[PDB]
Amino acid sequence: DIHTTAGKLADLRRRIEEATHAGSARAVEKQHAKGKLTARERIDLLLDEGSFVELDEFARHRSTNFGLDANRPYGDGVVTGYGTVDGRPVAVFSQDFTVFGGALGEVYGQKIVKVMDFALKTGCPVVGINDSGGARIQEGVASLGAYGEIFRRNTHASGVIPQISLVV
Amino acid sequence: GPCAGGAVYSPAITDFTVMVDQTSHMFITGPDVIKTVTGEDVGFEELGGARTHNSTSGVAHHMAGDEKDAVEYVKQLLSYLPSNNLSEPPAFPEEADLAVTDEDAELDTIVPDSANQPYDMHSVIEHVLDDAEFFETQPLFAPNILTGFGRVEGRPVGIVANQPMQFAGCLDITASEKAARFVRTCDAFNVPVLTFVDVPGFLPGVDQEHDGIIRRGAKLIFAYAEATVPLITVITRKAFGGAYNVMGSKHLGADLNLAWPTAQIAVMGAQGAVNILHRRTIADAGDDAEATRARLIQEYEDALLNPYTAAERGYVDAVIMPSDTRRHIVRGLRQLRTKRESLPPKKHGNIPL
Amino acid sequence: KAARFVRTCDAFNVPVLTFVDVPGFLPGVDQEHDGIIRRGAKLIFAYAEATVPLITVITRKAFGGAYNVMGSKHLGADLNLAWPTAQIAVMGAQGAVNILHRRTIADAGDDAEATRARLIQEYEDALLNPYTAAERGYVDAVIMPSDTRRHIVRGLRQLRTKRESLPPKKHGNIPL
Amino acid sequence: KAARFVRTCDAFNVPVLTFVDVPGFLPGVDQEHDGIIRRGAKLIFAYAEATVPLITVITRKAFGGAYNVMGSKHLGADLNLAWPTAQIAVMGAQGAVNILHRRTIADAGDDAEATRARLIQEYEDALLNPYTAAERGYVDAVIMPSDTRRHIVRGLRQLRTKRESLPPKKHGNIPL
């Protein structure tokens, strides 16, 4: 059902399934085909098995211009969160080429700001996994704002917490 | 024993006051002087005995049946607190069971299906805390909200939580002051706060307003926003309007906000919402109210009375199965153990007194 | 009302002049049941917390706890001035001996009404004065009421430069 | 050039006023193999690191990364102003519709232009303004050019007292 708690529980699991697989099975194959892994997977390999705790897994964009309103995939082209590497705390974000060419949206940039703020605040490294076609043009200036909010976080964090960029 | 006259104000400024049933009393004004002036008389027991100050006046935190118990309740209290504000509370480190346990699984059914059906918040809390052990402060005062300490992986934590069982878990003035001060106590002494929220909103009442719930409930907001200890809040069900922010929301700076699928994060409840919204539709084509109103109230409930709109904006960090709460709290406290923040120098803030 | 005004002033570096003619606290079970113990502690806290110039002038009465509540030397006030009309005591003449000379009640049975009525003014004629507080230096001086402005003017001049420290805290835990 | 002038101003408490007409980055393979990535990044660092007053005026084009590089609000600038001659978008007009609707430009696309050029112009009139930016508050205001001096005057007056913080570092790690 859905007017019951249990129907809500099971509702959440379909959600998880859809967010866990934001991209089409096809773009999934096509990234595999170039010999590379999915956004999740790159995280899995990076973090101590079992430690990954995802943030903003069900975030979705608000861009109406063009036909983006039509497709609002959980997360927003980026997987983010915290975990441990060799037992030490780390914050991670990983870009999903599988989604909008991995094109950086506004929510997608907000998710990144959120982990960057998390790490800065708790004093752990940020590992950034970069796999993107560029700016999600459809959202216009908004993408440019996102970029800016990040550059500034990068600068403020510089020499405070390590930042590693994995570009794949 | 008797704490008389202006003496009363000393304990008032201390963080915790503990007293015993029939053998302790506090008052600035004795009842003889009271009768002489106001015309009314009473005994020491009902003027400022232990019970009255634990259920009515809000000045005491614990009513012990006995001095030995009382001396025991002070010991517990200390055990959750550091020796001063320069250390962490004393930890007895233990490793958490990071898998799902049978106890954990009980939370997936704790929440009844009828919004009007209340469940016991003590339970949700005990399922999160080491050894299902919850050391509660002021249980008699403002029973509508719950406060106290416990441990997670051996580290003292504090709790604030709406209690559905009592007055629908509504916030009121007494709840605000109880909680506001407990949060600031934990903050000052470096104990993380965990918030469990099922909250319809504020107790309707003219007595409430005519004593400025406005400047009273604002204290709680201030306490959360002023705080720098780790803050993790879990929304088990209702988060409506002003109340949502009040209870340790992200906007006030909470570090990790989590919602069960049973959470309803909205500006107001369904009924009050549609009376305001499309009130045009209900009045016209107006067979009776119900017809279109009911279809509207549930079109609405099913559409927005979820935690998911909140979730697409990042207001809530994740929507989780309830049985995963303890494990979320555990992993979060671990990462949040090293939290450090800042702010513009002030002698002090100007909290709404 | 007052407690939040003192903090606003202290927060924003505004000096605080306090004038005290206070008999004591409003009697009432409604006063207690609603938490006077913890709500009135706020004024004590604000004054003690304050670091701005505090100048207190007692014009007439200051009894018991209310004495402390209103800018006393004990809470940290830098200048305390008392007019000759200030009665600074633990409690009123009546209340005082109505306990401390208990042994004269049915004592001198009939002449009791007159035995204690004189003890009332036998003490306020030697107690309800700023002068006990004076010898201990709880008040910095007793002075003509006509000199308060000049006293306030001169003190603020000297006091304009006051500073001091205390142990670090995120914040305090004022009764709430 | 600009990276170091900006940091020099910052160190010495000298406010920086920025004027922006930027089509974008000098296209060139050489520019890449020479490290434009780690070199242009420096300007970004200077502006974001700065704590002096920053007032940026967009006279005309602000495209792509270059928008941000040039004292954007997102890097912390306190007042960002736009002339109505300002064009703040991710990329120029024809570049945008190129990607945006190839389908339309190629389907029924016998006449390839007259659509391409119409889709442009439509794009230009709609987005190559400063107003989308203005909607989101990325730009504090859109002003008549003749008011620039008067905006800078009033803004500096107000920004004269500006102070900010940040977490201790020995020093930052700017790209070199």
Short mmCIF file of N, CA and C in Angstrom, two decimals, chain B residues 6 8-9 12-13 15 26-29 33-34 37-38 40 42 46-48 52-53 56-59 85 141 173 177 180-181 184-185 187-188 190 211 215-216 219 226 228-229 347-353, chain C residues 1 3-13 25-42 44-46 49-52 64-65 69 167-176:
data_model
loop_
_atom_site.label_atom_id
_atom_site.label_comp_id
_atom_site.label_asym_id
_atom_site.label_seq_id
_atom_site.Cartn_x
_atom_site.Cartn_y
_atom_site.Cartn_z
N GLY B 6 16.90 34.42 49.51
CA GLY B 6 17.70 34.72 48.34
C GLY B 6 18.68 33.60 48.04
N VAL B 8 17.92 30.66 47.42
CA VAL B 8 17.30 29.94 46.32
C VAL B 8 17.97 30.14 44.96
N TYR B 9 18.51 31.33 44.73
CA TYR B 9 19.03 31.70 43.41
C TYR B 9 20.37 31.09 43.07
N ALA B 12 19.77 27.93 41.33
CA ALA B 12 19.11 28.33 40.10
C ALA B 12 20.10 28.48 38.96
N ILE B 13 21.31 28.93 39.28
CA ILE B 13 22.31 29.23 38.25
C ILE B 13 23.15 27.99 37.93
N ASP B 15 23.82 24.11 36.81
CA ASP B 15 23.28 23.40 35.66
C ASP B 15 22.23 22.36 36.03
N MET B 26 12.55 24.70 48.51
CA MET B 26 13.17 25.97 48.08
C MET B 26 12.10 27.02 47.82
N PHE B 27 12.34 28.24 48.30
CA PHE B 27 11.42 29.36 48.10
C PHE B 27 12.02 30.72 48.52
N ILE B 28 11.80 31.75 47.70
CA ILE B 28 12.19 33.12 48.08
C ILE B 28 11.24 33.69 49.10
N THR B 29 10.02 33.15 49.14
CA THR B 29 8.98 33.67 50.03
C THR B 29 8.23 32.58 50.78
N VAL B 33 4.33 34.94 55.28
CA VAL B 33 4.46 36.21 54.58
C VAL B 33 3.54 36.24 53.35
N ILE B 34 3.33 35.08 52.74
CA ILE B 34 2.43 34.97 51.59
C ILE B 34 0.99 35.28 51.98
N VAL B 37 -0.01 38.92 52.82
CA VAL B 37 0.02 39.92 51.75
C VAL B 37 -0.94 39.64 50.59
N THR B 38 -1.00 38.38 50.16
CA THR B 38 -1.86 38.01 49.04
C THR B 38 -3.17 37.44 49.54
N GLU B 40 -3.54 34.29 50.58
CA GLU B 40 -3.57 32.84 50.41
C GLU B 40 -2.50 32.11 51.23
N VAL B 42 -0.68 28.04 52.21
CA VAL B 42 -0.32 26.76 51.66
C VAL B 42 0.71 26.16 52.60
N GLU B 46 3.64 21.94 49.19
CA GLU B 46 3.06 22.31 47.91
C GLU B 46 3.50 23.68 47.40
N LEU B 47 4.25 24.41 48.22
CA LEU B 47 4.80 25.69 47.77
C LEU B 47 6.10 25.48 47.00
N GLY B 48 6.97 24.61 47.52
CA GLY B 48 8.31 24.44 46.98
C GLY B 48 8.96 23.13 47.37
N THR B 52 6.55 19.63 43.44
CA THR B 52 6.06 20.82 42.75
C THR B 52 7.11 21.41 41.79
N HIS B 53 8.36 21.47 42.22
CA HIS B 53 9.44 22.03 41.40
C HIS B 53 9.88 21.11 40.25
N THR B 56 5.86 21.35 38.01
CA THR B 56 5.20 22.64 37.84
C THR B 56 6.15 23.80 37.52
N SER B 57 7.13 24.03 38.39
CA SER B 57 7.96 25.24 38.31
C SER B 57 9.13 25.14 37.33
N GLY B 58 9.56 23.93 37.00
CA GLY B 58 10.65 23.76 36.06
C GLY B 58 12.02 24.01 36.65
N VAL B 59 12.07 24.38 37.93
CA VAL B 59 13.36 24.70 38.55
C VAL B 59 14.24 23.48 38.93
N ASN B 85 35.00 22.48 30.82
CA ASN B 85 34.66 22.65 29.41
C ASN B 85 35.86 22.50 28.48
N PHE B 141 8.60 17.41 34.27
CA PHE B 141 8.33 18.74 33.75
C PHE B 141 8.21 18.64 32.23
N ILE B 173 5.51 26.37 25.75
CA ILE B 173 6.53 27.21 26.37
C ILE B 173 7.43 26.40 27.30
N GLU B 177 11.65 25.81 27.08
CA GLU B 177 12.61 26.20 28.11
C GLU B 177 13.38 25.00 28.68
N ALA B 180 15.57 23.97 25.48
CA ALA B 180 16.54 25.02 25.20
C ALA B 180 17.72 24.92 26.17
N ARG B 181 17.44 24.84 27.46
CA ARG B 181 18.54 24.88 28.41
C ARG B 181 19.37 23.61 28.44
N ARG B 184 21.83 23.80 25.60
CA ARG B 184 22.93 24.73 25.89
C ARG B 184 23.88 24.12 26.93
N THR B 185 23.32 23.30 27.81
CA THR B 185 24.15 22.58 28.78
C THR B 185 25.07 21.60 28.04
N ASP B 187 25.93 21.67 24.91
CA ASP B 187 26.87 22.43 24.09
C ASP B 187 28.05 22.91 24.90
N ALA B 188 27.76 23.50 26.05
CA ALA B 188 28.80 24.09 26.88
C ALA B 188 29.83 23.05 27.31
N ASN B 190 30.36 20.01 25.74
CA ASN B 190 30.94 19.22 24.66
C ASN B 190 30.26 17.87 24.39
N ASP B 211 1.62 34.87 27.21
CA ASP B 211 2.94 34.89 27.84
C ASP B 211 4.05 34.63 26.82
N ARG B 215 8.72 34.63 22.52
CA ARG B 215 10.08 34.86 23.02
C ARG B 215 10.53 33.67 23.85
N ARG B 216 9.67 32.66 23.88
CA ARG B 216 9.91 31.50 24.71
C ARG B 216 10.38 30.32 23.87
N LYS B 219 13.90 30.49 22.25
CA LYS B 219 15.08 30.06 23.00
C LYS B 219 15.70 28.76 22.46
N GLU B 226 23.21 28.30 18.06
CA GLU B 226 24.38 28.73 18.78
C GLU B 226 25.37 27.56 18.95
N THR B 228 27.76 24.18 18.72
CA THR B 228 28.88 23.78 17.88
C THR B 228 29.25 22.29 18.06
N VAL B 229 28.70 21.64 19.09
CA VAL B 229 28.82 20.21 19.21
C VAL B 229 28.13 19.53 18.02
N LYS B 347 30.96 39.28 23.49
CA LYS B 347 31.07 39.02 24.92
C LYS B 347 30.18 37.82 25.19
N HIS B 348 29.03 37.84 24.53
CA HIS B 348 27.98 36.87 24.70
C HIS B 348 26.80 37.25 23.80
N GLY B 349 25.89 36.31 23.62
CA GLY B 349 24.72 36.53 22.78
C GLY B 349 23.65 37.18 23.62
N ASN B 350 22.48 37.39 23.03
CA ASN B 350 21.43 38.11 23.72
C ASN B 350 20.14 37.32 23.66
N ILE B 351 20.25 36.05 24.06
CA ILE B 351 19.13 35.12 23.97
C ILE B 351 17.85 35.69 24.55
N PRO B 352 16.73 35.49 23.85
CA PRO B 352 15.44 35.98 24.36
C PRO B 352 15.19 35.42 25.75
N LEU B 353 15.37 36.24 26.77
CA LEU B 353 14.99 35.87 28.12
C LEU B 353 13.52 36.26 28.30
N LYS C 1 12.42 41.34 31.99
CA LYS C 1 12.50 42.64 31.32
C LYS C 1 13.89 43.25 31.48
N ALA C 3 16.66 41.87 32.98
CA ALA C 3 17.78 40.96 32.73
C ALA C 3 18.21 41.03 31.27
N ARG C 4 17.25 40.99 30.36
CA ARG C 4 17.57 41.15 28.94
C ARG C 4 18.03 42.55 28.52
N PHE C 5 17.67 43.56 29.31
CA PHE C 5 18.10 44.91 28.98
C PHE C 5 19.54 45.10 29.40
N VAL C 6 19.89 44.56 30.56
CA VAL C 6 21.28 44.60 31.00
C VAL C 6 22.21 43.87 30.04
N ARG C 7 21.77 42.74 29.49
CA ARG C 7 22.62 41.99 28.57
C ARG C 7 22.77 42.72 27.23
N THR C 8 21.67 43.28 26.74
CA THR C 8 21.74 44.08 25.53
C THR C 8 22.78 45.19 25.75
N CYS C 9 22.67 45.91 26.86
CA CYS C 9 23.61 46.99 27.12
C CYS C 9 25.03 46.45 27.22
N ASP C 10 25.21 45.42 28.02
CA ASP C 10 26.55 44.86 28.18
C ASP C 10 27.12 44.36 26.86
N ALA C 11 26.26 43.73 26.06
CA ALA C 11 26.67 43.22 24.75
C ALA C 11 27.19 44.33 23.88
N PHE C 12 26.50 45.48 23.93
CA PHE C 12 26.85 46.61 23.08
C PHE C 12 27.60 47.73 23.79
N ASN C 13 28.33 47.38 24.85
CA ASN C 13 29.25 48.32 25.52
C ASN C 13 28.62 49.56 26.12
N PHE C 25 10.72 40.58 47.01
CA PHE C 25 10.01 39.92 45.93
C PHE C 25 8.51 39.81 46.17
N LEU C 26 7.74 40.09 45.12
CA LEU C 26 6.31 39.84 45.12
C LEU C 26 5.99 38.48 45.75
N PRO C 27 5.17 38.47 46.81
CA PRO C 27 4.66 37.22 47.37
C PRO C 27 3.60 36.58 46.47
N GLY C 28 3.58 35.25 46.46
CA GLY C 28 2.62 34.50 45.68
C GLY C 28 3.08 33.09 45.35
N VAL C 29 2.17 32.12 45.53
CA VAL C 29 2.40 30.75 45.07
C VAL C 29 2.41 30.71 43.54
N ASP C 30 1.68 31.64 42.92
CA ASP C 30 1.72 31.81 41.48
C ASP C 30 3.09 32.32 41.02
N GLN C 31 3.74 33.13 41.85
CA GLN C 31 5.11 33.56 41.57
C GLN C 31 6.07 32.37 41.58
N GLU C 32 5.91 31.46 42.54
CA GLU C 32 6.81 30.31 42.63
C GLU C 32 6.48 29.22 41.62
N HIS C 33 5.22 28.82 41.59
CA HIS C 33 4.77 27.76 40.69
C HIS C 33 5.12 28.00 39.23
N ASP C 34 5.34 29.27 38.88
CA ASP C 34 5.71 29.66 37.52
C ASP C 34 7.22 29.89 37.38
N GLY C 35 7.96 29.63 38.47
CA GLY C 35 9.41 29.52 38.41
C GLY C 35 10.29 30.69 38.83
N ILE C 36 9.79 31.56 39.70
CA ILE C 36 10.55 32.73 40.15
C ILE C 36 11.99 32.39 40.54
N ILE C 37 12.18 31.17 41.05
CA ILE C 37 13.50 30.72 41.47
C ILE C 37 14.47 30.84 40.30
N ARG C 38 14.03 30.41 39.13
CA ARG C 38 14.89 30.36 37.96
C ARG C 38 14.79 31.59 37.05
N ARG C 39 13.65 32.28 37.07
CA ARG C 39 13.45 33.46 36.23
C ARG C 39 14.10 34.71 36.82
N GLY C 40 14.06 34.84 38.14
CA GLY C 40 14.67 35.97 38.80
C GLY C 40 16.17 35.81 38.91
N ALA C 41 16.65 34.61 38.63
CA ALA C 41 18.08 34.38 38.71
C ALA C 41 18.73 35.06 37.52
N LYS C 42 17.92 35.32 36.50
CA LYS C 42 18.40 35.95 35.28
C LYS C 42 19.01 37.34 35.52
N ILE C 44 20.37 38.45 38.41
CA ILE C 44 21.65 38.23 39.09
C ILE C 44 22.73 37.88 38.07
N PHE C 45 22.38 36.97 37.17
CA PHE C 45 23.32 36.49 36.16
C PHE C 45 23.79 37.60 35.22
N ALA C 46 22.84 38.42 34.78
CA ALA C 46 23.16 39.49 33.83
C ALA C 46 24.16 40.46 34.44
N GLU C 49 27.53 38.75 35.00
CA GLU C 49 28.14 38.48 33.70
C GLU C 49 28.70 39.77 33.11
N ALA C 50 27.99 40.88 33.35
CA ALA C 50 28.33 42.20 32.76
C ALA C 50 29.79 42.59 32.97
N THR C 51 30.37 43.27 31.98
CA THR C 51 31.71 43.80 32.13
C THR C 51 31.76 45.33 31.88
N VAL C 52 30.63 45.92 31.51
CA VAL C 52 30.54 47.36 31.34
C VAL C 52 30.53 48.03 32.71
N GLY C 64 17.38 41.74 51.69
CA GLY C 64 17.59 40.34 51.38
C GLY C 64 18.19 40.07 50.01
N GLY C 65 17.57 39.15 49.28
CA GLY C 65 18.06 38.78 47.96
C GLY C 65 17.96 39.88 46.93
N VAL C 69 20.23 41.28 43.77
CA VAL C 69 19.73 41.36 42.40
C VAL C 69 20.02 42.70 41.74
N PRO C 167 37.44 32.87 32.71
CA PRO C 167 37.83 31.68 31.94
C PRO C 167 36.98 31.43 30.69
N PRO C 168 37.62 30.96 29.61
CA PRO C 168 36.93 30.81 28.33
C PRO C 168 35.80 29.80 28.40
N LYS C 169 34.74 30.12 27.66
CA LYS C 169 33.56 29.26 27.52
C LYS C 169 32.95 29.57 26.15
N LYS C 170 32.35 28.58 25.51
CA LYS C 170 31.51 28.82 24.34
C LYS C 170 30.48 29.88 24.70
N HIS C 171 29.83 29.65 25.82
CA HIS C 171 28.81 30.55 26.32
C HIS C 171 28.46 30.08 27.70
N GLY C 172 27.56 30.81 28.33
CA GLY C 172 27.15 30.51 29.68
C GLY C 172 25.88 29.72 29.61
N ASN C 173 25.38 29.34 30.77
CA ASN C 173 24.23 28.47 30.82
C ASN C 173 23.14 29.12 31.64
N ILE C 174 22.86 30.39 31.34
CA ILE C 174 21.87 31.17 32.07
C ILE C 174 20.56 30.42 32.22
N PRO C 175 19.99 30.48 33.43
CA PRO C 175 18.65 29.91 33.63
C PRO C 175 17.76 30.34 32.47
N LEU C 176 16.81 29.49 32.10
CA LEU C 176 16.05 29.71 30.88
C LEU C 176 14.59 29.30 31.08
#
